Amino acid sequence: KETFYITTPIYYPSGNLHIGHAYSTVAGDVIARYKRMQGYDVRYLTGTDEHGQKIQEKAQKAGKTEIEYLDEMIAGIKQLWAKLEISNDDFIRTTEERHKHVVEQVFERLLKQGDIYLGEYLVKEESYFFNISKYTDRLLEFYDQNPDFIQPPSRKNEMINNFIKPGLADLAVSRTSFNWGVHVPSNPKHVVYVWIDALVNYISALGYLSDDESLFNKYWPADIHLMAKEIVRFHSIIWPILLMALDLPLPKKVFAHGWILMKDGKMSKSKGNVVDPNILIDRYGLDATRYYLMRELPFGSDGVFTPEAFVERTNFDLANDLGNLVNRTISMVNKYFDGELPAYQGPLHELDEEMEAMALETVKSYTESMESLQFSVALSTVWKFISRTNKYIDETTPWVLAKDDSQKDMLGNVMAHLVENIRYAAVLLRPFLTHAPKEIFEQLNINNPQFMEFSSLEQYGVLNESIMVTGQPKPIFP
Ligand SMILES: CNC(=O)c1ccc2c(c1)nc(-c1ccc(Br)c(O)c1)n2[C@@H](CNC(=O)OCc1ccccc1)c1ccc(OC)c(OC)c1
Numbered sequence: 001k002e003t004f005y006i007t008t009p010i011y012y013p014s015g016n017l018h019i020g021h022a023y024s025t026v027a028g029d030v031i032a033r034y035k036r037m038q039g040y041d042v043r044y045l046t047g048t049d050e051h052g053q054k055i056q057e058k059a060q061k062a063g064k065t066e067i068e069y070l071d072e073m074i075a076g077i078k079q080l081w082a083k084l085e086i087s088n089d090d091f092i093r094t095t096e097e098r099h100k101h102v103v104e105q106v107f108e109r110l111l112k113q114g115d116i117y118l119g120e121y122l123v124k125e126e127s128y129f130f131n132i133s134k135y136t137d138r139l140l141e142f143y144d145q146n147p148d149f150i151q152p153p154s155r156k157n158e159m160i161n162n163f164i165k166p167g168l169a170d171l172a173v174s175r176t177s178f179n180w181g182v183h184v185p186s187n188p189k190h191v192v193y194v195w196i197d198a199l200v201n202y203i204s205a206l207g208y209l210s211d212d213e214s215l216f217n218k219y220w221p222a223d224i225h226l227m228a229k230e231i232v233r234f235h236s237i238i239w240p241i242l243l244m245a246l247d248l249p250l251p252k253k254v255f256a257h258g259w260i261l262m263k264d265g266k267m268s269k270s271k272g273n274v275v276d277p278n279i280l281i282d283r284y285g286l287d288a289t290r291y292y293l294m295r296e297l298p299f300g301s302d303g304v305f306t307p308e309a310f311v312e313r314t315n316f317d318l319a320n321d322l323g324n325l326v327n328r329t330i331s332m333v334n335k336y337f338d339g340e341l342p343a344y345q346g347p348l349h350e351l352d353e354e355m356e357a358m359a360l361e362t363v364k365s366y367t368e369s370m371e372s373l374q375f376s377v378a379l380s381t382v383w384k385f386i387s388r389t390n391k392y393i394d395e396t397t398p399w400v401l402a403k404d405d406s407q408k409d410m411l412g413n414v415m416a417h418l419v420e421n422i423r424y425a426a427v428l429l430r431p432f433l434t435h436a437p438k439e440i441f442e443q444l445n446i447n448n449p450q451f452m453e454f455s456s457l458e459q460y461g462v463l464n465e466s467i468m469v470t471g472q473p474k475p476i477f478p
Protein backbone atom coordinates (compact mmCIF):
# COMPACT_ATOMS: atom_id res chain seq x y z
CA LYS A 1 0.00 0.00 0.00
CA GLU A 2 1.13 3.53 -0.89
CA THR A 3 1.45 5.71 2.21
CA PHE A 4 -0.44 8.93 2.90
CA TYR A 5 0.47 11.27 5.78
CA ILE A 6 -1.88 14.12 6.77
CA THR A 7 -1.60 16.54 9.71
CA THR A 8 -3.49 19.31 11.41
CA PRO A 9 -1.65 22.07 13.28
CA ILE A 10 -0.96 21.53 16.98
CA TYR A 11 -3.40 23.77 18.87
CA TYR A 12 -2.73 26.06 21.80
CA PRO A 13 -4.72 25.04 24.91
CA SER A 14 -4.77 28.54 26.48
CA GLY A 15 -8.57 28.16 26.35
CA ASN A 16 -11.21 25.73 25.09
CA LEU A 17 -11.36 24.80 21.41
CA HIS A 18 -14.23 26.12 19.29
CA ILE A 19 -15.58 25.15 15.84
CA GLY A 20 -12.67 26.85 14.02
CA HIS A 21 -10.32 24.20 15.44
CA ALA A 22 -13.00 21.59 14.82
CA TYR A 23 -13.03 22.53 11.11
CA SER A 24 -9.34 21.69 10.55
CA THR A 25 -9.64 18.39 12.43
CA VAL A 26 -12.83 17.35 10.59
CA ALA A 27 -11.31 18.41 7.23
CA GLY A 28 -8.17 16.40 8.05
CA ASP A 29 -10.39 13.46 9.00
CA VAL A 30 -12.43 13.72 5.75
CA ILE A 31 -9.16 13.48 3.79
CA ALA A 32 -7.87 10.63 6.00
CA ARG A 33 -11.09 8.58 5.67
CA TYR A 34 -11.33 9.27 1.92
CA LYS A 35 -7.70 8.16 1.40
CA ARG A 36 -8.22 4.96 3.44
CA MET A 37 -11.25 4.23 1.23
CA GLN A 38 -8.95 4.60 -1.83
CA GLY A 39 -6.60 1.91 -0.36
CA TYR A 40 -3.78 4.04 1.09
CA ASP A 41 -1.81 3.25 4.20
CA VAL A 42 -2.92 6.39 6.06
CA ARG A 43 -1.45 8.07 9.12
CA TYR A 44 -3.37 11.03 10.50
CA LEU A 45 -1.86 13.24 13.21
CA THR A 46 -3.13 16.06 15.43
CA GLY A 47 -1.87 17.50 18.72
CA THR A 48 -1.15 20.36 21.11
CA ASP A 49 1.44 23.10 21.58
CA GLU A 50 1.97 23.05 25.35
CA HIS A 51 4.92 25.43 25.94
CA GLY A 52 5.39 29.19 26.41
CA GLN A 53 4.88 31.71 29.22
CA LYS A 54 1.13 31.84 28.47
CA ILE A 55 0.46 28.15 29.37
CA GLN A 56 2.38 28.56 32.66
CA GLU A 57 0.28 31.67 33.39
CA LYS A 58 -3.01 29.78 32.79
CA ALA A 59 -1.92 26.94 35.12
CA GLN A 60 -0.93 29.35 37.92
CA LYS A 61 -4.29 31.17 37.60
CA ALA A 62 -6.13 27.83 37.75
CA GLY A 63 -4.11 26.94 40.91
CA LYS A 64 -2.41 23.99 39.18
CA THR A 65 0.98 22.87 37.94
CA GLU A 66 1.71 23.15 34.22
CA ILE A 67 1.24 19.42 33.42
CA GLU A 68 -1.79 19.17 35.77
CA TYR A 69 -3.45 22.00 33.85
CA LEU A 70 -2.27 20.67 30.47
CA ASP A 71 -3.52 17.10 31.15
CA GLU A 72 -7.02 18.42 31.96
CA MET A 73 -7.14 20.62 28.84
CA ILE A 74 -5.77 17.77 26.66
CA ALA A 75 -8.31 15.33 28.18
CA GLY A 76 -11.11 17.69 27.05
CA ILE A 77 -9.54 18.09 23.58
CA LYS A 78 -9.17 14.29 23.21
CA GLN A 79 -12.77 13.83 24.40
CA LEU A 80 -13.89 16.37 21.78
CA TRP A 81 -12.08 14.50 18.96
CA ALA A 82 -13.52 11.17 20.18
CA LYS A 83 -16.97 12.87 20.08
CA LEU A 84 -16.38 14.13 16.54
CA GLU A 85 -15.22 10.59 15.57
CA ILE A 86 -11.91 11.94 14.35
CA SER A 87 -9.86 8.99 13.04
CA ASN A 88 -6.42 10.30 14.13
CA ASP A 89 -3.83 7.54 14.55
CA ASP A 90 -1.88 9.46 17.21
CA PHE A 91 -1.96 12.62 19.34
CA ILE A 92 1.32 14.58 19.64
CA ARG A 93 2.05 16.63 22.78
CA THR A 94 5.12 18.88 23.03
CA THR A 95 5.44 18.04 26.76
CA GLU A 96 6.17 14.40 25.81
CA GLU A 97 9.78 13.22 26.01
CA ARG A 98 9.55 11.80 22.46
CA HIS A 99 9.03 15.42 21.32
CA LYS A 100 11.42 17.15 23.75
CA HIS A 101 14.25 14.83 22.69
CA VAL A 102 13.88 15.90 19.04
CA VAL A 103 13.71 19.63 19.85
CA GLU A 104 16.87 19.19 21.97
CA GLN A 105 18.78 17.17 19.35
CA VAL A 106 17.70 19.46 16.47
CA PHE A 107 18.66 22.66 18.34
CA GLU A 108 22.08 21.23 19.29
CA ARG A 109 22.66 20.07 15.71
CA LEU A 110 21.98 23.55 14.23
CA LEU A 111 24.31 24.95 16.93
CA LYS A 112 27.11 22.55 15.91
CA GLN A 113 26.61 23.28 12.18
CA GLY A 114 26.85 27.07 12.77
CA ASP A 115 23.22 27.61 11.66
CA ILE A 116 22.46 29.07 15.10
CA TYR A 117 24.50 31.80 16.86
CA LEU A 118 24.19 33.64 20.19
CA GLY A 119 23.12 37.30 20.13
CA GLU A 120 20.55 39.81 21.40
CA TYR A 121 17.09 40.79 20.18
CA LEU A 122 11.29 47.67 24.08
CA VAL A 123 11.73 43.90 23.60
CA LYS A 124 15.36 43.45 24.72
CA GLU A 125 16.52 39.90 25.51
CA GLU A 126 19.16 37.35 24.53
CA SER A 127 18.37 34.83 21.82
CA TYR A 128 19.91 32.28 19.51
CA PHE A 129 19.58 33.32 15.86
CA PHE A 130 18.91 31.04 12.89
CA ASN A 131 20.63 32.08 9.63
CA ILE A 132 17.80 31.31 7.15
CA SER A 133 18.74 33.60 4.19
CA LYS A 134 21.39 31.12 2.94
CA TYR A 135 18.51 28.71 2.03
CA THR A 136 16.65 31.36 -0.09
CA ASP A 137 17.55 30.25 -3.66
CA ARG A 138 17.04 26.63 -2.57
CA LEU A 139 13.52 27.48 -1.34
CA LEU A 140 12.59 29.44 -4.48
CA GLU A 141 14.04 26.61 -6.63
CA PHE A 142 11.82 24.15 -4.72
CA TYR A 143 8.74 26.34 -5.43
CA ASP A 144 9.59 26.26 -9.17
CA GLN A 145 9.91 22.44 -9.19
CA ASN A 146 6.76 22.03 -7.02
CA PRO A 147 4.15 24.50 -8.39
CA ASP A 148 1.26 22.91 -6.41
CA PHE A 149 3.18 23.11 -3.08
CA ILE A 150 1.02 25.90 -1.59
CA GLN A 151 -2.77 25.52 -1.82
CA PRO A 152 -4.48 27.75 -2.73
CA PRO A 153 -1.88 28.74 -5.42
CA SER A 154 -2.63 32.47 -4.79
CA ARG A 155 -0.81 32.41 -1.44
CA LYS A 156 2.53 31.17 -2.91
CA ASN A 157 3.06 34.47 -4.77
CA GLU A 158 2.24 36.34 -1.52
CA MET A 159 5.02 34.38 0.28
CA ILE A 160 7.66 35.33 -2.27
CA ASN A 161 6.58 38.98 -2.55
CA ASN A 162 5.89 39.86 1.13
CA PHE A 163 8.54 37.84 3.05
CA ILE A 164 11.25 36.45 0.72
CA LYS A 165 11.82 39.35 -1.73
CA PRO A 166 12.57 41.85 1.09
CA GLY A 167 14.98 39.23 2.50
CA LEU A 168 14.64 36.68 5.29
CA ALA A 169 16.11 38.16 8.49
CA ASP A 170 17.94 35.91 10.96
CA LEU A 171 15.18 34.20 12.98
CA ALA A 172 15.19 34.51 16.80
CA VAL A 173 14.73 30.88 17.94
CA SER A 174 15.18 31.09 21.73
CA ARG A 175 14.24 33.26 24.71
CA THR A 176 15.60 33.85 28.22
CA SER A 177 12.54 35.78 29.52
CA PHE A 178 10.45 32.63 30.19
CA ASN A 179 11.15 29.19 31.67
CA TRP A 180 8.17 26.99 30.63
CA GLY A 181 9.56 25.23 27.56
CA VAL A 182 12.36 23.03 26.22
CA HIS A 183 15.65 24.33 27.66
CA VAL A 184 18.68 24.35 25.33
CA PRO A 185 21.01 21.54 26.58
CA SER A 186 24.13 23.65 25.83
CA ASN A 187 22.80 26.84 27.45
CA PRO A 188 19.79 26.10 29.80
CA LYS A 189 18.91 29.75 30.60
CA HIS A 190 17.70 29.83 26.97
CA VAL A 191 14.43 28.10 26.15
CA VAL A 192 13.54 26.99 22.61
CA TYR A 193 10.93 29.35 21.16
CA VAL A 194 7.75 28.30 19.24
CA TRP A 195 9.40 28.13 15.77
CA ILE A 196 11.50 24.96 16.21
CA ASP A 197 9.42 23.55 19.09
CA ALA A 198 5.98 23.54 17.43
CA LEU A 199 7.10 22.71 13.85
CA VAL A 200 9.03 19.48 14.64
CA ASN A 201 5.87 17.76 16.09
CA TYR A 202 5.18 16.38 12.58
CA ILE A 203 8.41 14.34 12.66
CA SER A 204 8.88 13.81 16.45
CA ALA A 205 5.51 11.96 16.51
CA LEU A 206 6.92 9.50 13.91
CA GLY A 207 9.92 8.68 16.18
CA TYR A 208 12.56 10.80 14.36
CA LEU A 209 15.95 10.41 16.18
CA SER A 210 14.56 7.61 18.38
CA ASP A 211 15.82 4.01 18.36
CA ASP A 212 12.81 3.05 16.18
CA GLU A 213 12.29 5.37 13.20
CA SER A 214 9.90 3.02 11.33
CA LEU A 215 6.92 5.42 11.31
CA PHE A 216 9.25 8.19 10.11
CA ASN A 217 10.72 6.27 7.17
CA LYS A 218 7.27 4.93 6.25
CA TYR A 219 5.24 8.18 6.40
CA TRP A 220 7.64 11.17 6.04
CA PRO A 221 7.44 13.28 3.94
CA ALA A 222 3.95 14.54 4.75
CA ASP A 223 1.60 14.53 1.77
CA ILE A 224 -0.47 17.36 3.19
CA HIS A 225 -0.07 19.82 6.07
CA LEU A 226 -3.37 21.61 6.66
CA MET A 227 -3.97 24.84 8.56
CA ALA A 228 -5.78 28.18 8.53
CA LYS A 229 -4.17 30.86 6.34
CA GLU A 230 -2.42 32.82 9.14
CA ILE A 231 0.27 30.11 9.84
CA VAL A 232 1.21 29.40 6.20
CA ARG A 233 4.57 31.18 6.19
CA PHE A 234 5.81 29.10 9.18
CA HIS A 235 5.00 26.12 7.04
CA SER A 236 5.96 27.42 3.56
CA ILE A 237 9.20 29.21 4.52
CA ILE A 238 10.58 28.39 8.00
CA TRP A 239 9.56 24.70 8.00
CA PRO A 240 11.23 23.65 4.72
CA ILE A 241 14.34 25.74 5.60
CA LEU A 242 14.64 23.82 8.90
CA LEU A 243 14.14 20.56 6.96
CA MET A 244 16.98 21.62 4.60
CA ALA A 245 19.30 22.27 7.60
CA LEU A 246 18.51 18.73 8.85
CA ASP A 247 18.99 17.30 5.32
CA LEU A 248 15.40 16.02 5.36
CA PRO A 249 12.80 15.63 2.58
CA LEU A 250 10.34 18.53 2.31
CA PRO A 251 6.54 18.09 2.53
CA LYS A 252 4.58 17.68 -0.71
CA LYS A 253 1.78 20.15 -0.02
CA VAL A 254 0.64 22.82 2.45
CA PHE A 255 -3.10 23.57 2.41
CA ALA A 256 -4.29 26.81 3.93
CA HIS A 257 -8.07 26.83 4.18
CA GLY A 258 -10.10 29.93 5.09
CA TRP A 259 -11.75 30.92 8.35
CA ILE A 260 -15.09 30.09 9.86
CA LEU A 261 -16.54 33.59 10.36
CA MET A 262 -19.23 34.81 12.70
CA LYS A 263 -21.27 37.99 12.07
CA ASP A 264 -18.35 40.00 13.52
CA GLY A 265 -15.62 38.18 11.49
CA LYS A 266 -13.17 35.43 12.43
CA MET A 267 -14.15 32.99 15.19
CA SER A 268 -11.59 33.45 17.94
CA LYS A 269 -11.21 33.16 21.72
CA SER A 270 -10.35 36.92 21.94
CA LYS A 271 -13.36 38.34 19.99
CA GLY A 272 -15.84 36.38 22.15
CA ASN A 273 -17.62 34.98 19.09
CA VAL A 274 -17.04 31.35 20.05
CA VAL A 275 -19.33 28.45 19.18
CA ASP A 276 -18.55 25.38 21.28
CA PRO A 277 -18.65 22.19 19.11
CA ASN A 278 -19.84 20.12 22.13
CA ILE A 279 -23.12 22.10 22.16
CA LEU A 280 -23.83 21.68 18.42
CA ILE A 281 -23.13 17.93 18.64
CA ASP A 282 -25.24 17.34 21.79
CA ARG A 283 -28.32 19.08 20.33
CA TYR A 284 -28.21 18.43 16.58
CA GLY A 285 -26.04 15.30 16.40
CA LEU A 286 -22.57 14.54 15.08
CA ASP A 287 -23.38 14.34 11.35
CA ALA A 288 -25.07 17.78 11.34
CA THR A 289 -21.97 19.34 12.93
CA ARG A 290 -19.51 17.56 10.58
CA TYR A 291 -21.68 18.30 7.52
CA TYR A 292 -22.15 22.03 8.24
CA LEU A 293 -18.41 22.59 8.70
CA MET A 294 -17.32 20.92 5.43
CA ARG A 295 -20.23 22.20 3.32
CA GLU A 296 -19.90 25.91 4.31
CA LEU A 297 -16.19 26.73 3.82
CA PRO A 298 -15.25 26.72 0.12
CA PHE A 299 -11.78 26.34 -1.40
CA GLY A 300 -9.76 29.58 -1.35
CA SER A 301 -12.41 31.40 0.65
CA ASP A 302 -13.96 32.06 4.03
CA GLY A 303 -17.40 31.01 5.24
CA VAL A 304 -19.78 32.25 7.92
CA PHE A 305 -21.69 30.45 10.67
CA THR A 306 -25.11 31.58 11.85
CA PRO A 307 -27.65 29.55 13.92
CA GLU A 308 -30.24 30.11 11.14
CA ALA A 309 -27.92 28.78 8.42
CA PHE A 310 -27.01 25.78 10.59
CA VAL A 311 -30.57 24.55 11.20
CA GLU A 312 -31.44 25.28 7.54
CA ARG A 313 -28.43 23.27 6.31
CA THR A 314 -29.18 20.49 8.85
CA ASN A 315 -32.94 20.17 8.23
CA PHE A 316 -33.16 20.74 4.44
CA ASP A 317 -30.13 18.72 3.31
CA LEU A 318 -29.83 15.95 5.93
CA ALA A 319 -33.30 15.42 7.49
CA ASN A 320 -35.40 16.33 4.42
CA ASP A 321 -33.39 15.63 1.23
CA LEU A 322 -31.49 12.48 2.30
CA GLY A 323 -33.70 11.61 5.30
CA ASN A 324 -37.10 11.67 3.52
CA LEU A 325 -35.62 9.92 0.46
CA VAL A 326 -34.62 6.90 2.59
CA ASN A 327 -37.97 6.78 4.45
CA ARG A 328 -39.95 7.23 1.20
CA THR A 329 -38.02 4.38 -0.46
CA ILE A 330 -38.17 1.86 2.45
CA SER A 331 -41.92 2.61 3.00
CA MET A 332 -42.73 1.80 -0.64
CA VAL A 333 -40.67 -1.44 -0.66
CA ASN A 334 -42.48 -2.53 2.53
CA LYS A 335 -45.91 -1.51 1.15
CA TYR A 336 -45.74 -2.79 -2.47
CA PHE A 337 -43.44 -5.86 -2.11
CA ASP A 338 -43.79 -6.66 1.66
CA GLY A 339 -40.14 -5.62 2.22
CA GLU A 340 -38.58 -7.67 -0.60
CA LEU A 341 -36.50 -5.34 -2.79
CA PRO A 342 -36.64 -6.73 -6.34
CA ALA A 343 -33.26 -7.40 -7.93
CA TYR A 344 -31.73 -4.87 -10.31
CA GLN A 345 -32.11 -6.04 -13.93
CA GLY A 346 -31.05 -2.99 -16.00
CA PRO A 347 -32.22 0.50 -17.03
CA LEU A 348 -35.86 -0.56 -17.66
CA HIS A 349 -37.52 2.88 -17.25
CA GLU A 350 -36.90 5.61 -19.87
CA LEU A 351 -35.21 7.98 -17.35
CA ASP A 352 -32.83 5.25 -16.07
CA GLU A 353 -30.21 5.59 -18.83
CA GLU A 354 -29.42 9.23 -17.92
CA MET A 355 -29.86 8.73 -14.16
CA GLU A 356 -27.39 5.82 -14.19
CA ALA A 357 -24.96 7.96 -16.19
CA MET A 358 -25.56 10.83 -13.71
CA ALA A 359 -24.61 8.49 -10.84
CA LEU A 360 -21.27 7.71 -12.51
CA GLU A 361 -20.76 11.39 -13.43
CA THR A 362 -21.47 12.23 -9.74
CA VAL A 363 -18.72 9.81 -8.60
CA LYS A 364 -16.22 11.13 -11.18
CA SER A 365 -16.91 14.81 -10.36
CA TYR A 366 -16.86 14.02 -6.61
CA THR A 367 -13.43 12.44 -7.15
CA GLU A 368 -12.08 15.56 -8.93
CA SER A 369 -13.40 17.87 -6.17
CA MET A 370 -11.93 15.69 -3.40
CA GLU A 371 -8.53 15.39 -5.14
CA SER A 372 -8.41 19.22 -5.56
CA LEU A 373 -9.47 19.93 -1.91
CA GLN A 374 -12.90 21.31 -3.00
CA PHE A 375 -14.98 19.73 -0.23
CA SER A 376 -18.04 21.98 -0.44
CA VAL A 377 -18.22 21.36 -4.23
CA ALA A 378 -17.96 17.57 -3.63
CA LEU A 379 -20.83 17.66 -1.12
CA SER A 380 -23.03 19.94 -3.26
CA THR A 381 -22.53 17.56 -6.23
CA VAL A 382 -23.65 14.59 -4.07
CA TRP A 383 -26.77 16.60 -3.10
CA LYS A 384 -27.70 17.23 -6.77
CA PHE A 385 -27.78 13.44 -7.07
CA ILE A 386 -29.83 13.10 -3.85
CA SER A 387 -32.26 15.80 -5.11
CA ARG A 388 -32.62 14.10 -8.49
CA THR A 389 -33.41 10.78 -6.72
CA ASN A 390 -36.28 12.44 -4.79
CA LYS A 391 -37.41 13.99 -8.10
CA TYR A 392 -37.24 10.48 -9.69
CA ILE A 393 -39.94 9.39 -7.19
CA ASP A 394 -42.12 12.34 -8.32
CA GLU A 395 -41.58 11.61 -12.04
CA THR A 396 -42.15 7.82 -11.83
CA THR A 397 -45.10 7.94 -9.37
CA PRO A 398 -44.63 4.37 -7.93
CA TRP A 399 -48.07 4.47 -6.20
CA VAL A 400 -49.80 4.71 -9.61
CA LEU A 401 -47.66 1.82 -10.94
CA ALA A 402 -48.58 -0.32 -7.89
CA LYS A 403 -52.28 -0.34 -8.94
CA ASP A 404 -51.48 -2.04 -12.27
CA ASP A 405 -50.27 -5.65 -11.89
CA SER A 406 -48.94 -5.50 -15.49
CA GLN A 407 -46.42 -2.87 -14.26
CA LYS A 408 -45.04 -4.89 -11.29
CA ASP A 409 -41.68 -5.39 -13.08
CA MET A 410 -41.34 -1.68 -13.89
CA LEU A 411 -42.28 -0.82 -10.29
CA GLY A 412 -39.57 -3.20 -9.06
CA ASN A 413 -37.09 -1.47 -11.38
CA VAL A 414 -38.00 1.91 -9.83
CA MET A 415 -37.47 0.54 -6.28
CA ALA A 416 -34.08 -0.92 -7.33
CA HIS A 417 -32.93 2.40 -8.84
CA LEU A 418 -33.86 4.29 -5.65
CA VAL A 419 -31.91 1.86 -3.44
CA GLU A 420 -28.87 1.96 -5.78
CA ASN A 421 -29.02 5.80 -5.95
CA ILE A 422 -29.15 5.79 -2.12
CA ARG A 423 -26.24 3.34 -2.00
CA TYR A 424 -24.11 5.58 -4.26
CA ALA A 425 -24.77 8.55 -1.94
CA ALA A 426 -24.06 6.56 1.25
CA VAL A 427 -20.66 5.30 -0.05
CA LEU A 428 -19.75 8.85 -1.20
CA LEU A 429 -20.74 10.38 2.18
CA ARG A 430 -18.64 7.92 4.27
CA PRO A 431 -15.63 10.27 4.56
CA PHE A 432 -17.91 13.13 5.73
CA LEU A 433 -20.65 11.46 7.81
CA THR A 434 -19.89 8.61 10.28
CA HIS A 435 -23.44 7.64 11.44
CA ALA A 436 -25.91 8.15 8.56
CA PRO A 437 -24.30 5.90 5.88
CA LYS A 438 -23.89 3.04 8.38
CA GLU A 439 -27.52 3.57 9.47
CA ILE A 440 -28.61 3.53 5.78
CA PHE A 441 -26.60 0.36 5.02
CA GLU A 442 -28.10 -1.45 8.05
CA GLN A 443 -31.70 -0.38 7.24
CA LEU A 444 -31.43 -1.44 3.56
CA ASN A 445 -29.78 -4.69 4.77
CA ILE A 446 -26.35 -4.28 3.21
CA ASN A 447 -24.18 -6.23 5.69
CA ASN A 448 -21.41 -7.16 3.21
CA PRO A 449 -18.74 -4.37 3.29
CA GLN A 450 -18.09 -4.94 -0.44
CA PHE A 451 -21.20 -2.77 -1.04
CA MET A 452 -19.71 0.12 1.01
CA GLU A 453 -16.44 0.70 -0.94
CA PHE A 454 -15.55 3.06 -3.79
CA SER A 455 -14.81 0.23 -6.26
CA SER A 456 -18.46 -0.92 -5.92
CA LEU A 457 -19.55 2.34 -7.67
CA GLU A 458 -17.73 1.57 -10.98
CA GLN A 459 -20.74 -0.20 -12.50
CA TYR A 460 -24.33 0.77 -11.68
CA GLY A 461 -26.71 -1.84 -10.28
CA VAL A 462 -24.85 -4.23 -8.05
CA LEU A 463 -27.82 -5.91 -6.40
CA ASN A 464 -28.98 -8.70 -8.67
CA GLU A 465 -30.47 -10.72 -6.11
CA SER A 466 -33.54 -9.88 -4.22
CA ILE A 467 -32.93 -8.80 -0.60
CA MET A 468 -35.17 -7.96 2.36
CA VAL A 469 -35.12 -4.38 3.70
CA THR A 470 -35.99 -3.42 7.30
CA GLY A 471 -39.63 -3.90 8.35
CA GLN A 472 -39.26 -1.22 11.07
CA PRO A 473 -37.58 1.88 9.56
CA LYS A 474 -36.43 4.81 11.71
CA PRO A 475 -35.20 8.37 11.08
CA ILE A 476 -31.52 8.48 10.08
CA PHE A 477 -30.88 11.87 11.73
CA PRO A 478 -29.87 13.22 14.14
C1 LIG B 1 -3.96 35.75 23.18
N1 LIG B 1 -3.02 34.64 23.08
C2 LIG B 1 -1.73 34.78 23.38
O1 LIG B 1 -1.32 35.67 24.12
C3 LIG B 1 -0.78 33.77 22.81
C4 LIG B 1 -1.02 33.24 21.53
C5 LIG B 1 -0.16 32.31 20.97
C6 LIG B 1 0.94 31.91 21.72
C7 LIG B 1 1.19 32.41 22.99
C8 LIG B 1 0.33 33.36 23.55
N2 LIG B 1 2.37 31.87 23.50
C9 LIG B 1 2.82 31.07 22.55
C10 LIG B 1 4.06 30.29 22.68
C11 LIG B 1 5.24 30.93 23.05
C12 LIG B 1 6.41 30.22 23.19
C13 LIG B 1 6.41 28.85 22.95
BR1 LIG B 1 8.01 27.88 23.16
C14 LIG B 1 5.24 28.19 22.57
O2 LIG B 1 5.26 26.86 22.32
C15 LIG B 1 4.07 28.92 22.44
N3 LIG B 1 2.00 31.06 21.44
C16 LIG B 1 2.23 30.37 20.16
C17 LIG B 1 1.14 29.33 19.90
N4 LIG B 1 1.53 28.30 18.95
C18 LIG B 1 0.84 28.08 17.82
O3 LIG B 1 -0.13 28.71 17.47
O4 LIG B 1 1.39 27.08 17.12
C19 LIG B 1 0.91 26.93 15.75
C20 LIG B 1 1.82 26.00 15.01
C21 LIG B 1 1.49 24.67 14.83
C22 LIG B 1 2.32 23.82 14.12
C23 LIG B 1 3.49 24.30 13.57
C24 LIG B 1 3.84 25.62 13.75
C25 LIG B 1 3.01 26.47 14.46
C26 LIG B 1 2.55 31.37 19.07
C27 LIG B 1 3.67 32.19 19.20
C28 LIG B 1 4.05 33.06 18.20
C29 LIG B 1 3.31 33.13 17.03
O5 LIG B 1 3.62 33.89 15.93
C30 LIG B 1 4.39 35.08 16.13
C31 LIG B 1 2.16 32.33 16.89
O6 LIG B 1 1.50 32.45 15.70
C32 LIG B 1 0.87 31.28 15.16
C33 LIG B 1 1.78 31.48 17.92
Ligand SMILES: Nc1ncnc2c1ncn2[C@@H]1O[C@H](COP(=O)(O)OP(=O)(O)OP(=O)(O)O)[C@@H](O)[C@H]1O
Pocket (backbone or CB within 6 Å): 009, 011, 019, 020, 021, 023, 024, 226, 227, 228, 229, 230, 231, 258, 259, 260, 261, 266, 267, 268, 269, 270, 271
Ligand atom coordinates in the same frame (compact mmCIF):
# COMPACT_ATOMS: atom_id res chain seq x y z
N1 LIG C 1 -11.91 30.49 12.80
C1 LIG C 1 -11.13 29.49 12.37
N2 LIG C 1 -11.32 29.02 11.11
C2 LIG C 1 -10.55 28.02 10.68
N3 LIG C 1 -9.57 27.37 11.32
C3 LIG C 1 -9.41 27.85 12.56
C4 LIG C 1 -10.13 28.88 13.15
N4 LIG C 1 -9.72 29.08 14.46
C5 LIG C 1 -8.79 28.18 14.64
N5 LIG C 1 -8.54 27.40 13.53
C6 LIG C 1 -7.56 26.32 13.43
O1 LIG C 1 -6.68 26.41 14.55
C7 LIG C 1 -5.37 26.85 14.11
C8 LIG C 1 -4.83 27.89 15.06
O2 LIG C 1 -5.83 28.91 15.26
P1 LIG C 1 -5.68 30.29 16.04
O3 LIG C 1 -4.39 30.44 16.75
O4 LIG C 1 -6.07 31.40 15.05
O5 LIG C 1 -6.92 30.09 17.03
P2 LIG C 1 -7.41 30.73 18.42
O6 LIG C 1 -7.66 29.71 19.52
O7 LIG C 1 -8.78 31.31 18.06
O8 LIG C 1 -6.54 32.01 18.74
P3 LIG C 1 -6.68 33.47 19.38
O9 LIG C 1 -7.96 33.62 20.16
O10 LIG C 1 -5.43 33.64 20.25
O11 LIG C 1 -6.57 34.43 18.17
C9 LIG C 1 -5.58 27.33 12.67
O12 LIG C 1 -4.39 27.24 11.91
C10 LIG C 1 -6.67 26.37 12.19
O13 LIG C 1 -6.15 25.07 11.93
